[PDB]
Amino acid sequence: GSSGSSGSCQYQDLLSNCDSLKNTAGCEHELLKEKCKATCLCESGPSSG
């Protein structure tokens, strides 16, 4: 099983190239503003906390 749900905080970015985007464009964008909630909020784990 290659295509599956792995590593997820909570939100589910509507887009796909959220990272690639945020990476540069940054969530600041309007496309990856909310639709890229994950990339925005979600990341991996307790980064700051």
Query: For the chain, what is the domain count?
Result: 1
| C-alpha 25: how far from chain center | 13
CATH of the domain at 5: 1.10.10.740
Strands (E), 1-49: none
Report the alpha-carbon distance of residue 21 to residue 33 in Å, rounded: 10
Q: Which domain does 30 fall in, by range?
A: 1-49
Closest Cα to residue 21, out of 11, 34, 9, 10?
34
Report the alpha-carbon distance of residue 29 to residue 10 in Å, rounded: 21
- Please tell me whether residue 19 adopts helix, strand or coil conformation: helix
Q: Is 7 left (phi over 0), alpha (psi -120 to 50) or beta?
A: left
Report the alpha-carbon distance of residue 6 to residue 8 in Å, rounded: 6
* Gaps in the chain (C to N distance exceeding 2.5 A) after: none
What does the radius of gyration of the chain's CA atoms come to, in whole angstroms? 11
